[model samples]
Target: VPRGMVGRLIYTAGGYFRQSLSYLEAYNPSNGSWLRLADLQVPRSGLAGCVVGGLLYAVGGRNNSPDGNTDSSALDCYNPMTNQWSPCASMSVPRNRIGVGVIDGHIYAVGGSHGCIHHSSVERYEPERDEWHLVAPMLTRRIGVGVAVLNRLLYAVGGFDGTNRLNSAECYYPERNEWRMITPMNTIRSGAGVCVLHNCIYAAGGYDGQDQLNSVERYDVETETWTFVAPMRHHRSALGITVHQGKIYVLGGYDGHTFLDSVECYDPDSDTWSEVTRMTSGRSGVGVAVTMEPC
Candidate 1:
């Protein structure tokens, strides 16, 4: 997804149990319809995906087959132009429920889990080199953490740290090659949707250990403060989110009781949320990416 290209928003593989899915779908806001695309090389769940240099990169997640549980370090790239997926260099470590973000031209894979072990480790990927290198780790070990790039820095938000759900937040400065703890969120959440629109970072719906949350908050880059915003209509954990045309689009997720196929859109200007079309099937932990192609 190019930064300024008008493109389609895509949602890919995700599942729970042996239900790990492989179908790929794209949402075109202009027409309000979905177009099915190529399936993944392997079915997976809890994967983290991001767009860098106009290509969609899907990273670490679990392949929960009936035979056994497996964590992945696999890296797959999708090209919207050709509607194809190609293999890329894998990550250094296997991880599931990881937080992924792009800064400058590199992708950073943050805290996640391998089996029951939560990871505080971090890795950076150089697309040109197609290789990953270990970088400064986060201050806290977390699984299902939400991450996004803002103001040229990577922000890793709340998640479960084995025993407790977290409200803590941290920022990584690539130039300094260091991690710094920042103001915590108003609520403790895991598997929340995080994205940047305008200059502020928005953290939306997630699990707070006890319950699914519909609450949303925005972080100011300059003041380093978090402020509450209008909540979503549905409680969402493990949801897919992306910014398109200045609005935030949140896709399918778990709402404590059920997997959701419903979609919601948020307008920062109006401070409101509106329900949109639903997906073909209910899903959680789905990978989402938005990219632009030439008109």
Candidate 2:
């Protein structure tokens, strides 16, 4: 979430059994309230979204297809003031399961998939121009990657790279226009909830190819290594994750057997996880963003 008067968790399209959604909901922690916002222009699942300079942007994802062959490059933006959604510049490549992050006012759309083929391609979007440009690609092709910004750099975490669930990590340097590998995670997984809190990156529950997982890990920028953290209470994959008020929140996702509505919060100070109010609906492939309402 971007800093603001009220922190809102904005959830976009997601569902199960080829049931894509266009519904949009915003959760406000200050009042423990939920507001129905304008729906996405195009229904989708397995998408990624982030807030940049007070505006919310939804990136590529798959449509309502059992096989997920309807990959989309549609991009949409939301304005809190007007409570409306409008189409923006689309990506050059169609994809789903994308990882997105904002750095220095630009949005980076990282690894994802096009149909059944995984992609390592990266692209950058300049909101001011409403345009996108190709950037340095990742070394390993991946889908369901987790991305976040830390210390002005973009980090791409664990994801499925075609054949394997990846524990590998990488960092992108915009100045050099390059990506370099970093330390791998202890557990191989994809579709995890990832966010940066107090300079460290935290990756929560995800699928490890065969099963849903509850394990969590923290990446130290200074040490360039990952260490185990307390596991989440529920096994989750394709979860929506963000940080607010110094605490990390893990939202709706799918356990192995069913979609999840339960939410959890991790207090880094205590190193413990606790359940929070559940969402109204259970969903996977949900896109989440945190934004602070302006004064």
User: How do the residues 1-295 of candidate 2 rate in per-residue lDDT, one tens digit apiece?
Assistant: 3445455554544434348777677776666667677778778888887988778788888887555458878888888777788899899998789999999899899989997789999999999999999999998898999999998999999999889999998999999999999999998879998889997888898899898989999999999889988899999999989886688888888888878888888989899999877787888888888764422
Clashing pairs in 1: none
Global Cα lDDT for candidate 1: 0.86
Which segments of candidate 2 are over 4 A away from where they belong? 1-18, 65-69, 292-295
**Model 2 error, position 90 (Å):** 0.4
TM-score of candidate 1 versus the correct structure, residues matched by position: 0.95
The Cα local distance difference test for each model comes to 0.86, 0.84
For residues 42-154, what per-residue lDDT tens digits would candidate 1 score against the true structure?
88788888888888888898888786778989899988777889999998888899989999889999988998899999999999999999999999998999999987999
After TM-score superposition, what is the CA distance of residue 110 in candidate 1 from its true location, in Å?
0.5
lDDT of 1 at 166: 94
Name the regions of candidate 1 deviating beyond 4 angstroms.
Answer: 1-6, 293-295
- Going through the candidates in the order shown, the clash numbers are 0, 3
